[PDB]
Amino acid sequence: NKYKLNYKSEEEYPDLSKHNNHMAKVLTPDLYKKLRDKETPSGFTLDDVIQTGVDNPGHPFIMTVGCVAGDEESYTVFKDLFDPIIQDRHGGFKPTDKHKTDLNHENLKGGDDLDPHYVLSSRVRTGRSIKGYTLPPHCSRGERRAVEKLSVEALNSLTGEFKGKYYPLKSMTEQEQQQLIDDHFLFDKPVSPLLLASGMARDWPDARGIWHNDNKSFLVWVNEEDHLRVISMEKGGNMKEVFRRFCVGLQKIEEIFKKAGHPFMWNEHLGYVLTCPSNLGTGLRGGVHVKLAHLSKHPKFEEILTRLRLQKRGTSVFDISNADRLGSSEVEQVQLVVDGVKLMVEMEKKLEKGQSIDDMIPAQK
Amino acid sequence: NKYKLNYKSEEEYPDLSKHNNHMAKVLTPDLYKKLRDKETPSGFTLDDVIQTGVDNPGHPFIMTVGCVAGDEESYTVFKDLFDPIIQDRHGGFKPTDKHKTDLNHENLKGGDDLDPHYVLSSRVRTGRSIKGYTLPPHCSRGERRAVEKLSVEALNSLTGEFKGKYYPLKSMTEQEQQQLIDDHFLFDKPVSPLLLASGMARDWPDARGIWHNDNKSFLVWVNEEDHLRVISMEKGGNMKEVFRRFCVGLQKIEEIFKKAGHPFMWNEHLGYVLTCPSNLGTGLRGGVHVKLAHLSKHPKFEEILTRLRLQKRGTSVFDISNADRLGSSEVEQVQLVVDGVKLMVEMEKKLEKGQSIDDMIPAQK
């Protein structure tokens, strides 16, 4: 990435011509001129935020964020870039709005145990950053190793439902690796160019690794896209339990990290901070794998997804999850999943009977 | 890449465990400790030289250099790393040896017009760096654009045998591009991980481009692996003429660049400097495409290649070229090509007749 202030702003300004990303829509020659000479306490500059957006012009059909933060201070130092990108990507969320965090699983009160004939598996995942180290697109091997070191020691101390074991990618045996492959716990070097272009793939697999509890119901990936990626999963429909395991496991790693002088990066405005702006706030994606045989063929599938504020992705089973991140707490996001997936299983149980279905007005369930 | 001097040398030292590259053989904890705090006038550090070697452990069968220079001063500033790597890769070439350059095509005197029934095409290529800008793994868009700017204006002024036209990759029409594809003049974004890991692919295709004369006998690629890549080619066997066009065209771009305050990077010890250490000296690769029907099946093909000091690669036609770069001048390298390919066509004309063949002792032809 890197700039050179001996050069004129216009000589260094990126050619964002046929680019279709949140970064390219916001950058103007002035914004670059104004912020091109700044940098974070760690040496992270604007050229470094926008690099992956200069390299990846993408496709007109879909918009990527096109930029990353290498620090907790990148969001502040370069707020004039990030601010409008955050308001756009996250539905008008202003520079002056606040993000409420809610990990009291007891507040899911009104959320349940979804139909096993339709919900194959239930799952909640989030991403965390650790205060004190820079984010993956910038962190040094020393920083990476410290994050891995701190995490492994926290995880190794966990006990009971949370007792588990760590699996470094570097010295992984074929047996240890095939297991993880058919356990769905494995990750490898990023092939995505949006990921590769921000420089977060350097030194692979130094300090990267995989941790999971003995029950294989709780998983943590270390040093991949963000310092930590945590997941609570289950076969079936007990979303309450998946969220509760998730919440309790998170609070146990969080206090160990607090005590060591390294809490999860978090601020009243952005909630939990992570490397990609589209993940700010909760970093959460709670979802299910549902059999929507008829509903998915229905003309109003897309619209019903939108009004329930959920979204889907491949796997006639779909991976449906909440679509919000900033502006709403985790209890409210996993609440919308329980609600709209309950509704959709009802709708599917009607079409099975040749009956017509009824949508709800927007933003509920 | 990047380091952090607040960290202990051992916390930042790379895990070069099962790596098989020239860099990994030379780095020791002390060498890193000693040089990790240095940097070139441009900000280029050791983490930046060795990065592509930390990322690419490679294959035990073949050795890669595993490091790059982002400056003319990287070779000096980090001489303790580069020095032994250069002596190893280039056959004992000491820190105190000198490189003689020889672009007097008249000195090819004793070199000719190779057999057209066996030599399909003749070709000489080299790489150049332009003094004043950093090398591709580090250069900014501003620097890249300046190199492109300076080159295009030099090339555009050339006339006669050398009149030509420039083709930017950025605004290339499909017609302009298919032509170049079936003209064998086209290049695109690097897929090699050794290339991608040193950061030289940033901003693609900003400031990259393709230039060729009207005769399609002279070609220059701008801002790809090195600032410039120049090639003189021809169908057939007139190696004298391919070298002469090559030498004359090079001297014409060289004087234009001298006059502007930007000569080709060159020093009495390393000859022409380029981003990869394996290319130092001449950066030259003169070669031919030869029909070696019987000789290539011969048990002593590999050995005869070695004693002639040539090497081959795919395309029963082979692409045979000189194997040396540092320690020998260009006239001596293209001389070894004319000589050994003349010898090999003779050998092939014997096997065609059921006769036995005779090798020469090492380092000649």
Side-chain angles (χ1 to χ4, degrees), chain A residues 1-4 7 10-15 32 41-43 47 50-51 54-56 132-133 138-143 145-146 170 189 199 201-204 206, chain B residues 1-4 7 10-15 32 41-43 47 50-51 54-56 132-133 138-143 145-146 170 189 201-204 206:
Chain A
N1 341 59
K2 217 218 168 46
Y3 54 176
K4 171 91 298 163
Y7 275 90
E10 61 189 295
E11 295 182 61
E12 300 287 341
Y13 188 69
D15 179 339
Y32 190 70
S42 75
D47 272 334
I50 74 171
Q51 193 63 77
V54 168
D55 290 358
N56 308 109
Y133 305 92
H138 196 242
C139 78
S140 63
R141 300 168 200 116
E143 290 184 288
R145 298 180 178 157
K170 145 282 318 174
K189 183 170 178 164
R202 289 170 290 113
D203 317 305
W204 202 277
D206 205 281
Chain B
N1 341 59
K2 217 218 168 46
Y3 54 176
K4 171 91 298 163
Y7 275 90
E10 61 189 295
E11 295 182 61
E12 300 287 341
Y13 188 69
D15 179 339
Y32 190 70
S42 75
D47 272 334
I50 74 171
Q51 193 63 77
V54 168
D55 290 358
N56 308 109
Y133 305 92
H138 196 242
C139 78
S140 63
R141 300 168 200 116
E143 290 184 288
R145 298 180 178 157
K170 145 282 318 174
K189 183 170 178 164
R202 289 170 290 113
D203 317 305
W204 202 277
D206 205 281

Coordinates of all heavy atoms in Angstrom, one line a residue, chain A residues 1-4 7 10-15 32 41-43 47 50-51 54-56 132-133 138-143 145-146 170 189 199 201-204 206, chain B residues 1-4 7 10-15 32 41-43 47 50-51 54-56 132-133 138-143 145-146 170 189 201-204 206:
Chain A
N1 N 0.9 -1.2 0.0 CA 0.0 0.0 0.0 C 1.0 1.2 0.0 O 1.7 1.5 -1.0 CB -0.9 -0.1 1.3 CG -0.9 -1.5 2.0 OD1 0.1 -2.0 2.4 ND2 -2.1 -2.0 2.2
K2 N 1.1 1.9 1.1 CA 2.0 3.1 1.3 C 1.9 4.2 0.4 O 1.7 4.1 -0.8 CB 3.5 2.5 1.2 CG 4.5 3.1 2.2 CD 5.9 3.2 1.5 CE 6.8 4.0 2.3 NZ 6.8 3.6 3.8
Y3 N 2.2 5.4 0.9 CA 2.1 6.7 0.1 C 3.5 7.3 0.0 O 4.4 6.6 0.3 CB 1.2 7.7 0.9 CG 1.7 8.0 2.4 CD1 1.0 8.9 3.2 CD2 2.7 7.2 3.0 CE1 1.3 9.1 4.5 CE2 3.0 7.4 4.4 CZ 2.3 8.4 5.1 OH 2.6 8.6 6.5
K4 N 3.6 8.6 -0.3 CA 4.8 9.4 -0.3 C 4.5 10.8 -0.4 O 4.2 11.4 -1.5 CB 5.8 9.0 -1.5 CG 7.0 10.0 -1.6 CD 8.2 9.6 -0.8 CE 7.9 9.5 0.7 NZ 9.0 8.8 1.4
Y7 N 5.3 13.4 -3.0 CA 4.4 13.5 -4.1 C 3.2 14.3 -4.0 O 2.6 14.4 -2.9 CB 4.0 12.1 -4.6 CG 5.1 11.5 -5.4 CD1 6.1 10.7 -4.8 CD2 5.1 11.7 -6.8 CE1 7.1 10.2 -5.5 CE2 6.2 11.2 -7.5 CZ 7.2 10.4 -6.9 OH 8.2 9.9 -7.6
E10 N -2.5 14.6 -6.1 CA -3.1 14.2 -7.4 C -2.2 13.1 -8.0 O -2.7 12.4 -8.9 CB -3.3 15.3 -8.3 CG -2.0 16.0 -8.6 CD -2.1 17.3 -9.3 OE1 -2.6 17.3 -10.5 OE2 -1.7 18.3 -8.7
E11 N -1.0 13.0 -7.7 CA -0.1 12.0 -8.3 C -0.2 10.7 -7.6 O 0.0 9.6 -8.1 CB 1.4 12.5 -8.1 CG 1.8 13.7 -9.0 CD 3.2 14.1 -8.8 OE1 4.1 13.2 -9.2 OE2 3.6 15.2 -8.3
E12 N -0.7 10.8 -6.3 CA -1.0 9.6 -5.5 C -2.5 9.2 -5.4 O -2.7 8.1 -4.8 CB -0.4 9.8 -4.1 CG 1.1 10.0 -4.0 CD 1.9 8.8 -4.3 OE1 1.3 7.7 -4.2 OE2 3.1 8.9 -4.6
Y13 N -3.4 10.0 -5.8 CA -4.8 9.8 -5.7 C -5.1 8.5 -6.5 O -4.7 8.4 -7.7 CB -5.6 10.9 -6.3 CG -7.1 10.8 -6.0 CD1 -7.6 10.9 -4.7 CD2 -8.0 10.5 -7.1 CE1 -9.0 10.7 -4.5 CE2 -9.3 10.3 -6.8 CZ -9.8 10.4 -5.6 OH -11.2 10.3 -5.3
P14 N -5.9 7.6 -5.9 CA -6.3 6.4 -6.7 C -7.3 6.6 -7.9 O -8.1 7.5 -7.9 CB -6.8 5.4 -5.7 CG -7.2 6.3 -4.5 CD -6.2 7.4 -4.5
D15 N -7.1 5.8 -8.9 CA -8.0 5.8 -10.1 C -9.1 4.9 -9.7 O -9.0 3.7 -9.9 CB -7.2 5.3 -11.3 CG -8.1 5.2 -12.5 OD1 -9.4 5.3 -12.4 OD2 -7.6 5.2 -13.7
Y32 N -8.8 12.8 0.2 CA -7.5 12.2 0.1 C -6.5 13.3 0.5 O -5.7 13.0 1.4 CB -7.2 11.6 -1.3 CG -6.0 10.8 -1.4 CD1 -6.0 9.5 -0.8 CD2 -4.9 11.2 -2.0 CE1 -4.8 8.7 -0.9 CE2 -3.7 10.5 -2.1 CZ -3.7 9.2 -1.5 OH -2.5 8.5 -1.5
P41 N -1.3 5.8 15.7 CA -0.1 5.6 16.6 C 0.8 4.5 16.1 O 2.0 4.6 16.3 CB -0.7 5.3 17.9 CG -2.0 6.0 17.9 CD -2.5 5.6 16.5
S42 N 0.2 3.5 15.3 CA 0.9 2.4 14.8 C 1.5 2.5 13.4 O 2.2 1.6 12.9 CB 0.1 1.1 14.9 OG -1.0 1.1 13.9
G43 N 1.3 3.6 12.7 CA 1.8 3.8 11.4 C 0.9 3.6 10.3 O 1.3 3.7 9.1
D47 N -3.7 5.1 2.8 CA -3.4 4.2 1.6 C -3.6 2.8 2.1 O -4.1 2.0 1.3 CB -1.9 4.4 1.2 CG -1.8 5.5 0.1 OD1 -2.7 5.8 -0.6 OD2 -0.7 6.0 0.0
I50 N -7.7 2.1 2.2 CA -8.3 2.0 0.9 C -7.7 1.0 -0.1 O -8.2 0.8 -1.1 CB -8.4 3.4 0.2 CG1 -7.0 3.9 -0.2 CG2 -9.0 4.4 1.2 CD1 -7.0 5.2 -1.1
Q51 N -6.5 0.4 0.3 CA -5.8 -0.4 -0.7 C -6.6 -1.6 -1.3 O -6.7 -1.7 -2.5 CB -4.5 -1.0 0.0 CG -3.6 -1.7 -1.1 CD -3.1 -0.7 -2.1 OE1 -2.1 0.1 -1.9 NE2 -3.6 -0.8 -3.4
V54 N -8.8 -0.3 -3.8 CA -8.2 0.1 -5.1 C -7.9 -1.1 -5.9 O -8.1 -1.1 -7.1 CB -7.0 0.9 -4.8 CG1 -6.2 1.1 -6.1 CG2 -7.3 2.2 -4.1
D55 N -7.6 -2.2 -5.3 CA -7.2 -3.4 -5.9 C -8.4 -4.2 -6.4 O -8.4 -4.9 -7.4 CB -6.4 -4.3 -5.0 CG -5.1 -3.8 -4.7 OD1 -4.7 -2.8 -5.2 OD2 -4.4 -4.5 -3.9
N56 N -9.5 -4.1 -5.7 CA -10.8 -4.8 -6.0 C -11.9 -3.9 -6.5 O -12.8 -3.5 -5.7 CB -11.2 -5.7 -4.9 CG -10.0 -6.6 -4.4 OD1 -9.4 -6.3 -3.3 ND2 -9.6 -7.5 -5.2
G132 N -5.0 -3.5 22.2 CA -3.5 -3.5 22.5 C -2.7 -3.9 21.3 O -1.5 -3.6 21.2
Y133 N -3.3 -4.6 20.4 CA -2.7 -5.1 19.2 C -3.3 -4.5 17.9 O -4.4 -4.0 18.0 CB -2.7 -6.6 19.2 CG -2.2 -7.2 20.5 CD1 -3.0 -7.4 21.5 CD2 -0.8 -7.4 20.6 CE1 -2.5 -7.9 22.7 CE2 -0.3 -7.9 21.8 CZ -1.2 -8.2 22.8 OH -0.7 -8.7 24.0
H138 N -2.4 -5.3 9.4 CA -1.2 -4.6 9.8 C -0.3 -5.2 10.8 O 0.9 -5.0 10.8 CB -1.7 -3.2 10.3 CG -0.6 -2.2 10.4 ND1 -0.2 -1.6 11.6 CD2 0.1 -1.5 9.4 CE1 0.7 -0.7 11.4 NE2 0.8 -0.6 10.1
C139 N -0.9 -6.0 11.7 CA -0.1 -6.7 12.7 C 1.1 -7.5 12.3 O 1.2 -8.2 11.3 CB -1.0 -7.6 13.6 SG -1.5 -9.1 12.9
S140 N 2.2 -7.3 13.1 CA 3.5 -7.9 12.9 C 3.4 -9.4 13.5 O 2.5 -9.7 14.3 CB 4.5 -7.1 13.6 OG 4.3 -7.1 15.0
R141 N 4.4 -10.2 13.2 CA 4.4 -11.6 13.7 C 4.5 -11.6 15.2 O 4.1 -12.5 15.8 CB 5.7 -12.3 13.2 CG 5.8 -12.5 11.7 CD 7.2 -13.0 11.4 NE 7.4 -12.7 10.0 CZ 8.4 -11.8 9.6 NH1 9.3 -11.3 10.4 NH2 8.4 -11.6 8.3
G142 N 5.1 -10.5 15.7 CA 5.3 -10.4 17.2 C 3.9 -10.1 17.7 O 3.6 -10.8 18.7
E143 N 3.1 -9.2 17.1 CA 1.8 -8.9 17.6 C 0.9 -10.1 17.4 O 0.2 -10.6 18.4 CB 1.2 -7.7 16.9 CG 1.9 -6.4 17.3 CD 1.2 -5.3 16.7 OE1 1.4 -5.0 15.5 OE2 0.6 -4.5 17.5
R145 N 1.7 -13.3 17.3 CA 2.0 -14.4 18.3 C 1.5 -14.1 19.7 O 1.2 -15.0 20.5 CB 3.5 -14.5 18.3 CG 4.1 -15.0 17.0 CD 5.6 -15.2 17.0 NE 6.1 -15.7 15.7 CZ 7.3 -15.5 15.2 NH1 8.3 -14.9 15.9 NH2 7.6 -16.0 14.0
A146 N 1.5 -12.8 20.1 CA 1.1 -12.3 21.4 C -0.4 -12.6 21.5 O -0.9 -13.0 22.6 CB 1.4 -10.9 21.5
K170 N 0.2 -24.7 11.8 CA 1.6 -25.0 11.5 C 2.1 -26.5 11.6 O 2.7 -27.0 10.7 CB 2.5 -24.0 12.0 CG 3.9 -24.5 12.5 CD 3.8 -25.1 13.9 CE 2.9 -24.4 14.9 NZ 2.6 -25.1 16.2
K189 N -5.6 -20.7 4.4 CA -5.2 -19.4 3.9 C -6.2 -18.9 2.9 O -6.7 -19.6 2.1 CB -3.9 -19.6 3.1 CG -3.4 -18.2 2.6 CD -2.0 -18.4 2.1 CE -1.5 -17.1 1.5 NZ 0.0 -17.1 1.3
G199 N -3.3 -7.2 2.9 CA -2.1 -7.7 3.6 C -2.3 -8.6 4.8 O -1.3 -8.8 5.5
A201 N -2.8 -11.7 5.1 CA -2.4 -13.1 4.9 C -0.9 -13.4 5.0 O -0.4 -14.6 4.8 CB -2.9 -13.6 3.5
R202 N -0.1 -12.4 5.4 CA 1.4 -12.5 5.6 C 1.7 -13.5 6.6 O 1.0 -13.6 7.6 CB 1.9 -11.1 6.1 CG 1.9 -10.0 5.1 CD 2.2 -8.7 5.9 NE 1.0 -8.3 6.7 CZ 1.0 -8.3 8.1 NH1 2.1 -8.7 8.7 NH2 -0.1 -8.1 8.7
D203 N 2.8 -14.2 6.4 CA 3.4 -15.2 7.4 C 2.6 -16.4 7.6 O 2.9 -17.1 8.6 CB 3.7 -14.5 8.7 CG 4.3 -13.2 8.6 OD1 5.4 -13.1 7.9 OD2 3.8 -12.2 9.1
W204 N 1.6 -16.7 6.8 CA 0.7 -17.9 7.0 C 1.5 -19.2 7.1 O 2.3 -19.4 6.2 CB -0.2 -18.0 5.8 CG -1.4 -18.8 6.1 CD1 -1.6 -20.1 6.1 CD2 -2.7 -18.3 6.6 NE1 -2.8 -20.5 6.6 CE2 -3.5 -19.4 6.9 CE3 -3.2 -17.0 6.9 CZ2 -4.8 -19.3 7.4 CZ3 -4.5 -16.9 7.4 CH2 -5.3 -18.0 7.6
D206 N 1.8 -18.7 10.5 CA 2.4 -18.3 11.8 C 1.3 -17.8 12.7 O 0.5 -17.0 12.3 CB 3.4 -17.2 11.5 CG 4.5 -17.2 12.6 OD1 4.2 -16.7 13.7 OD2 5.6 -17.7 12.3
Chain B
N1 N 4.0 -6.6 5.4 CA 5.3 -7.1 5.8 C 5.4 -6.3 7.2 O 4.7 -6.6 8.2 CB 6.4 -6.7 4.8 CG 5.8 -6.3 3.4 OD1 5.0 -5.4 3.2 ND2 6.4 -6.9 2.4
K2 N 6.3 -5.3 7.3 CA 6.5 -4.5 8.5 C 6.9 -5.2 9.8 O 6.4 -6.2 10.1 CB 5.2 -3.7 8.7 CG 5.3 -2.2 9.2 CD 4.2 -1.9 10.2 CE 4.5 -0.6 10.8 NZ 4.9 0.5 9.9
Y3 N 7.7 -4.5 10.6 CA 8.2 -4.9 11.9 C 7.6 -4.1 13.0 O 6.7 -3.4 12.7 CB 9.8 -4.7 11.9 CG 10.3 -3.3 11.6 CD1 11.6 -3.0 11.7 CD2 9.5 -2.3 11.2 CE1 12.2 -1.8 11.4 CE2 10.0 -1.0 10.8 CZ 11.3 -0.8 10.9 OH 11.9 0.4 10.6
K4 N 8.2 -4.1 14.2 CA 7.9 -3.3 15.3 C 9.0 -3.5 16.4 O 9.1 -4.4 17.2 CB 6.6 -3.6 16.0 CG 6.4 -2.9 17.3 CD 5.7 -1.5 17.2 CE 6.5 -0.5 16.3 NZ 5.6 0.6 15.9
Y7 N 9.1 -4.6 19.8 CA 9.1 -6.0 20.1 C 10.5 -6.6 20.1 O 11.4 -6.1 19.4 CB 8.3 -6.8 19.0 CG 6.9 -6.8 19.4 CD1 6.0 -5.8 19.0 CD2 6.4 -7.8 20.2 CE1 4.7 -5.8 19.4 CE2 5.1 -7.8 20.6 CZ 4.3 -6.8 20.2 OH 3.0 -6.7 20.6
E10 N 13.4 -11.8 18.8 CA 13.0 -13.2 18.8 C 11.4 -13.3 18.7 O 10.9 -14.3 18.3 CB 13.4 -13.9 20.1 CG 12.9 -13.2 21.3 CD 13.4 -13.7 22.6 OE1 13.2 -14.9 22.9 OE2 14.1 -12.9 23.3
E11 N 10.7 -12.2 19.0 CA 9.3 -12.2 18.9 C 8.9 -11.9 17.5 O 7.8 -12.3 17.0 CB 8.7 -11.1 19.9 CG 8.9 -11.4 21.3 CD 8.2 -10.3 22.2 OE1 7.0 -10.2 22.1 OE2 8.9 -9.6 23.0
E12 N 9.8 -11.2 16.8 CA 9.5 -10.9 15.3 C 10.3 -11.8 14.3 O 10.1 -11.7 13.1 CB 9.9 -9.4 15.1 CG 9.2 -8.4 15.9 CD 7.7 -8.3 15.4 OE1 7.4 -8.7 14.3 OE2 6.9 -7.8 16.2
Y13 N 11.2 -12.6 14.8 CA 12.0 -13.5 13.9 C 11.1 -14.4 13.2 O 10.2 -15.1 13.8 CB 13.0 -14.3 14.7 CG 14.0 -15.0 13.8 CD1 15.0 -14.4 13.1 CD2 14.0 -16.4 13.7 CE1 15.8 -15.0 12.2 CE2 14.8 -17.1 12.9 CZ 15.8 -16.4 12.2 OH 16.6 -17.1 11.4
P14 N 11.3 -14.6 11.9 CA 10.4 -15.5 11.2 C 10.7 -17.0 11.4 O 11.8 -17.4 11.7 CB 10.6 -15.1 9.7 CG 11.9 -14.4 9.6 CD 12.0 -13.7 10.9
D15 N 9.6 -17.8 11.4 CA 9.7 -19.2 11.5 C 10.0 -19.7 10.2 O 9.1 -20.0 9.4 CB 8.3 -19.8 12.0 CG 8.3 -21.3 12.1 OD1 9.2 -22.0 11.6 OD2 7.5 -21.8 12.8
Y32 N 19.1 -11.1 11.8 CA 17.9 -10.4 11.9 C 18.0 -9.3 13.0 O 17.8 -8.2 12.7 CB 16.7 -11.4 12.2 CG 15.3 -10.8 12.2 CD1 14.7 -10.4 10.9 CD2 14.6 -10.5 13.3 CE1 13.5 -9.8 10.9 CE2 13.4 -9.9 13.3 CZ 12.8 -9.6 12.0 OH 11.6 -8.9 12.0
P41 N 16.6 4.9 2.4 CA 16.1 6.2 2.4 C 14.7 6.3 2.2 O 14.0 7.2 2.7 CB 16.9 6.8 1.3 CG 18.2 6.1 1.3 CD 17.7 4.7 1.4
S42 N 14.1 5.3 1.6 CA 12.7 5.2 1.2 C 11.8 4.5 2.2 O 10.5 4.5 2.1 CB 12.5 4.6 -0.2 OG 12.7 3.2 -0.2
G43 N 12.3 3.9 3.3 CA 11.5 3.3 4.3 C 11.5 1.8 4.2 O 10.8 1.1 5.0
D47 N 12.1 -6.7 6.9 CA 10.9 -7.5 6.9 C 10.3 -7.5 5.5 O 9.7 -8.4 5.0 CB 9.8 -6.9 7.8 CG 9.9 -7.5 9.2 OD1 10.4 -8.6 9.4 OD2 9.5 -6.9 10.2
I50 N 12.5 -10.0 3.1 CA 12.3 -11.4 3.3 C 10.9 -11.9 3.3 O 10.6 -13.0 3.4 CB 12.9 -11.8 4.7 CG1 12.1 -11.2 5.9 CG2 14.4 -11.3 4.7 CD1 12.6 -11.8 7.2
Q51 N 9.9 -10.9 3.2 CA 8.5 -11.3 3.3 C 8.0 -12.4 2.3 O 7.4 -13.4 2.7 CB 7.6 -10.1 3.1 CG 6.1 -10.3 3.5 CD 5.9 -10.7 4.9 OE1 5.9 -9.9 5.8 NE2 5.6 -12.0 5.2
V54 N 9.1 -15.6 3.5 CA 8.5 -16.1 4.7 C 7.1 -16.7 4.3 O 6.8 -17.8 4.8 CB 8.3 -15.0 5.7 CG1 7.3 -15.5 6.8 CG2 9.6 -14.6 6.3
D55 N 6.5 -16.1 3.3 CA 5.2 -16.6 2.8 C 5.3 -17.8 1.9 O 4.4 -18.6 1.8 CB 4.6 -15.4 2.0 CG 4.1 -14.3 2.9 OD1 4.3 -14.3 4.1 OD2 3.6 -13.3 2.3
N56 N 6.4 -17.9 1.1 CA 6.6 -19.0 0.2 C 7.7 -20.0 0.6 O 8.8 -19.8 0.2 CB 6.8 -18.4 -1.2 CG 5.7 -17.4 -1.5 OD1 6.0 -16.3 -1.6 ND2 4.5 -17.9 -1.7
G132 N 16.0 6.6 -9.3 CA 15.2 7.7 -8.8 C 13.9 7.2 -8.2 O 13.3 8.0 -7.5
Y133 N 13.5 6.0 -8.6 CA 12.2 5.5 -8.1 C 12.4 4.2 -7.4 O 13.5 3.6 -7.6 CB 11.3 5.3 -9.3 CG 11.2 6.6 -10.1 CD1 12.0 6.8 -11.2 CD2 10.2 7.5 -9.8 CE1 11.9 8.0 -11.9 CE2 10.0 8.6 -10.5 CZ 10.9 8.9 -11.6 OH 10.7 10.1 -12.3
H138 N 7.6 -1.9 -3.7 CA 7.5 -0.8 -2.7 C 6.9 0.5 -3.3 O 6.3 1.3 -2.6 CB 8.9 -0.5 -2.1 CG 8.9 0.3 -0.9 ND1 9.5 1.5 -0.9 CD2 8.4 0.1 0.3 CE1 9.4 2.0 0.4 NE2 8.8 1.2 1.1
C139 N 7.2 0.7 -4.6 CA 6.7 1.9 -5.3 C 5.3 2.3 -5.1 O 4.4 1.5 -5.2 CB 7.2 1.9 -6.7 SG 6.1 1.0 -7.8
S140 N 5.0 3.6 -4.9 CA 3.7 4.2 -4.8 C 3.1 4.5 -6.1 O 3.9 4.5 -7.1 CB 3.9 5.5 -4.0 OG 4.7 6.4 -4.7
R141 N 1.8 4.8 -6.2 CA 1.2 5.0 -7.5 C 1.8 6.2 -8.1 O 1.8 6.3 -9.3 CB -0.3 5.3 -7.3 CG -1.1 4.3 -6.7 CD -2.5 4.8 -6.3 NE -3.1 3.9 -5.3 CZ -3.3 4.3 -4.1 NH1 -3.2 5.6 -3.7 NH2 -3.8 3.4 -3.2
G142 N 2.3 7.1 -7.3 CA 2.9 8.3 -7.8 C 4.2 8.0 -8.5 O 4.4 8.5 -9.6
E143 N 5.0 7.1 -7.8 CA 6.2 6.7 -8.4 C 6.0 5.8 -9.7 O 6.6 6.1 -10.7 CB 7.1 5.9 -7.4 CG 7.6 6.8 -6.3 CD 8.5 6.0 -5.4 OE1 8.0 5.2 -4.6 OE2 9.8 6.2 -5.5
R145 N 3.4 5.9 -11.7 CA 3.0 6.8 -12.8 C 4.1 7.6 -13.5 O 4.1 7.9 -14.7 CB 1.9 7.7 -12.3 CG 0.7 7.0 -11.8 CD -0.4 7.9 -11.3 NE -1.6 7.2 -10.8 CZ -2.5 7.6 -10.0 NH1 -2.4 8.8 -9.4 NH2 -3.5 6.8 -9.7
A146 N 5.1 8.0 -12.7 CA 6.2 8.8 -13.1 C 7.1 7.9 -14.0 O 7.6 8.4 -15.0 CB 7.0 9.2 -11.9
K170 N -5.2 -0.5 -18.6 CA -6.4 0.1 -18.1 C -7.6 0.4 -19.0 O -8.7 0.0 -18.8 CB -6.1 1.2 -17.1 CG -7.1 2.4 -17.1 CD -6.9 3.3 -18.3 CE -5.4 3.6 -18.6 NZ -5.1 4.4 -19.9
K189 N -2.2 -9.4 -14.6 CA -1.9 -9.4 -13.2 C -1.3 -10.7 -12.8 O -1.8 -11.8 -13.2 CB -3.1 -9.2 -12.4 CG -2.9 -9.2 -10.9 CD -4.1 -8.7 -10.1 CE -3.8 -8.7 -8.7 NZ -4.9 -7.9 -8.0
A201 N 2.0 -6.2 -6.8 CA 0.7 -6.2 -7.6 C -0.4 -5.2 -7.2 O -1.5 -5.2 -7.8 CB 0.1 -7.6 -7.5
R202 N -0.1 -4.3 -6.2 CA -1.0 -3.3 -5.7 C -1.4 -2.3 -6.9 O -0.6 -2.0 -7.7 CB -0.2 -2.4 -4.7 CG 0.1 -3.0 -3.4 CD 1.0 -2.1 -2.6 NE 2.3 -2.1 -3.2 CZ 2.9 -1.1 -3.8 NH1 2.3 0.1 -4.0 NH2 4.1 -1.3 -4.4
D203 N -2.6 -1.8 -6.8 CA -3.1 -0.9 -7.8 C -3.3 -1.3 -9.2 O -3.5 -0.5 -10.1 CB -2.3 0.4 -7.8 CG -2.0 0.9 -6.4 OD1 -2.9 1.0 -5.6 OD2 -0.8 1.0 -6.1
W204 N -3.2 -2.6 -9.5 CA -3.3 -3.2 -10.9 C -4.6 -2.8 -11.6 O -5.7 -2.9 -11.0 CB -3.3 -4.7 -10.8 CG -2.9 -5.3 -12.1 CD1 -3.7 -5.5 -13.2 CD2 -1.5 -5.6 -12.5 NE1 -2.9 -6.0 -14.2 CE2 -1.6 -6.0 -13.8 CE3 -0.3 -5.6 -11.8 CZ2 -0.5 -6.5 -14.5 CZ3 0.8 -6.0 -12.5 CH2 0.7 -6.5 -13.9
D206 N -3.0 0.1 -12.7 CA -2.6 1.5 -12.7 C -1.2 1.6 -13.2 O -0.3 0.9 -12.8 CB -2.7 2.1 -11.3 CG -2.9 3.6 -11.3 OD1 -1.9 4.4 -11.5 OD2 -4.0 4.0 -11.1

